[PDB]
């Protein structure tokens, strides 16, 4: 049977683009498309796609459940058996829902997190989708209670493959392949097992307005970047790590609150070290 | 004699042709004994030698979970490698890993191994000390820094000193009468004319295990190592191997040529001649 795929993603915004490819007998040409209900009726009045089918700009009419058949001249029927099914989901058709993490977006290796999607729009289903190429979304039925619909996606035990930027979508009854605008994104980061860095203050954690204080994140491990986080959920500051003469790796964040720092590496933004011990800065 | 266990992983992307695929195979010496292939409808680690088949269900369940996890891990590593090398997600790439242990006659560890490759060239390898890495390029140097920060080598060392040795010993016992009993080659020489001044003499070794063997041609006692055609040792398909060695000889000089065969299954090295 052929292998059908959507590129770059089967989850695609209205106005975007997605291409279906039907790989069969070591070629990408000569195939027909079918949608789930009509199984022996080729779409587009039996159009024989001469190459990959580019849908662009994407409209809601593109949303659907597809299979392909590849040409097979020297066989009983003209064509192959049906491919695996690919569901093109078109986003941007309803107000966006909301996505939050419980207890939070930084998840220790091996542990679990809940990603809750919710909306005051009644969505029949919710979809959770991690940003990237060729990734499948998770689906859950929405549950109604006190004027909202919502779903809980459980993620874990936490590892790198599960880390990244997540968005959630709702779809409403009778248009299951049409998704809402995406929720605001949530970066879910895995912490550990890389060794925790050290956090310190210069000249010290006691400061009174208006004099300068720099926090330094340091490690013997060759971290490429440091992330400084202050309890209370404003997004971490980031700085490149610099190698010092005694071979430690350090970044200096010139700035109260309770802080922690994490190390990370090049090309790897969603996996961080264990958190440093906390440091309390007072003004 | 000394023995080895090795696992070999191949993880491949193939955008537009299929889902990424992960295949693992396990060998004791030259004998494959397990396989796992992510493409199977319901993938499981499966026996590929008879002496492992009676291992209990807890073994298979355990090996299967690990391979499923490993498949997942390596799918992500392919993605990571793309970022390290600034390559497009349209291209097809391969990660290969081999790891395992060698033990001596007393069953004790001689050497541990853990080597990885990206697109068929060395990427990163655990050193003989089992506590440090050799990275082949700048991309691999990122991985090295992660692994040092995560104390990966300690974990690998613990595996190599412990479970690896322990399981190899178990398998060697389970399969003793095949794995630990060398089968000597059956040998013969054939003669094939080339012109009416020259001919080929071919020395054959068949049905031997293990694969290690030496076939040499001598001419009045001097090796013709410069004028010998040596074919790659090849599997017979029944867990034995085959090889031949050929030499072009002048007509009427067949009698000065002797074929010499060395293999552990042979009591004394063999000396054959065409007749």
């Amino acid at each position: 049977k052929p292998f059908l795929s959507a590129w770059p993603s089967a989850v695609v915004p209205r106005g975007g683009h997605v291409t279906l490819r039907c790989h069969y007998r070591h070629r990408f040409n000569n195939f027909m498309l079918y949608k789930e209900d009509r199984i022996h009726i080729p779409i587009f009045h039996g159009r024989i796609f001469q190459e990959s089918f580019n849908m662009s700009p994407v409209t809601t009419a593109h949303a659907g459940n597809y299979t392909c058949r590849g040409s097979h001249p020297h066989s009983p029927t003209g064509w192959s058996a049906p491919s695996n099914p690919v569901v093109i989901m078109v986003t941007g058709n309803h107000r966006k829902p909301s996505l939050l993490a419980h207890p939070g977006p930084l998840v220790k290796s091996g542990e679990r997190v809940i990603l809750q999607c919710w909306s005051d729009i009644m969505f029949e289903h919710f979809f959770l989708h991690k940003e990237g190429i060729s990734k499948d979304p998770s689906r859950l039925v929405g549950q109604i209670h006190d004027g909202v619909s919502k779903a809980n996606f459980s993620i874990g035990p936490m590892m790198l493959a599960l880390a990244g930027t997540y968005r959630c979508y709702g779809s409403v009854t009778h248009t299951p392949y049409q998704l809402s605008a995406p929720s605001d994104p949530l970066d879910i980061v895995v912490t550990g097992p890389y060794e925790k860095p050290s956090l310190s203050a210069q000249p010290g954690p006691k400061v009174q307005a208006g004099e300068s204080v720099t926090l330094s994140c340091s490690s013997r491990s060759s971290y490429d970047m440091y992330h400084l986080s202050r309890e209370g959920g404003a997004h971490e500051r980031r700085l490149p790590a610099v190698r010092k003469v005694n071979r430690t790796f350090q970044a200096d964040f010139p700035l109260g609150g309770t802080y922690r720092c994490f190390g990370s590496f090049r090309h790897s933004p969603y996996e961080w070290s264990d958190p440093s011990d906390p440091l309390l800065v007072s003004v | 004699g000394s023995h080895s266990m090795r696992y070999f992983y191949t993880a491949m992307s193939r955008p537009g042709r299929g889902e990424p695929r992960f295949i693992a195979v396990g060998y004791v010496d030259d004998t494959q004994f397990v396989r796992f292939d992510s493409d199977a409808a319901s993938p499981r680690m499966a026996p590929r030698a008879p002496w492992i088949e009676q291992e209990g269900p807890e073994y298979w369940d355990g090996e299967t979970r690990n391979m499923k996890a490993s498949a997942q891990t390596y799918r992500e590593n392919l993605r990571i490698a793309l970022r390290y090398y600034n390559q497009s997600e349209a291209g097809s790439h391969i990660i290969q890993v081999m790891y395992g242990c060698d033990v001596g006659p007393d069953g004790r560890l001689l050497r541990g191994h853990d080597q990885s490759a990206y697109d068929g060239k060395d990427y990163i390898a655990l050193n003989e000390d089992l506590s440090s890495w050799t990275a082949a390029d700048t991309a691999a140097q990122i991985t090295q820094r992660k692994w040092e920060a995560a104390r990966v080598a300690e974990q690998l060392r613990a595996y190599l000193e412990g479970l690896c040795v322990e399981w190899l010993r178990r398998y060697l016992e389970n399969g003793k009468e095949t794995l630990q009993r060398a089968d000597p080659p059956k040998t013969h020489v054939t003669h094939h004319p080339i012109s009416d001044h020259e001919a080929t003499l071919r020395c054959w070794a068949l049905g031997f295990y293990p694969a290690e063997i030496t076939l040499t041609w001598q001419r009045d006692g001097e090796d013709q190592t410069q004028d010998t055609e040596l074919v790659e040792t090849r599997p017979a398909g029944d867990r034995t191997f085959q090889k031949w060695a050929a030499v072009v000889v002048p007509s009427g000089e067949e009698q000065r040529y002797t074929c010499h065969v060395q293999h552990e299954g042979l009591p004394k090295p063999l000396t054959l001649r065409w007749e």
Binding site: - | Y7, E63, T73, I80, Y159
Partner: peptide
């Protein structure tokens, strides 16, 4: 396990 149980990311 007989195979390496530790999961190792690049």
């Amino acid at each position: 396990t007989s195979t390496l149980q530790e999961q190792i990311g690049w």
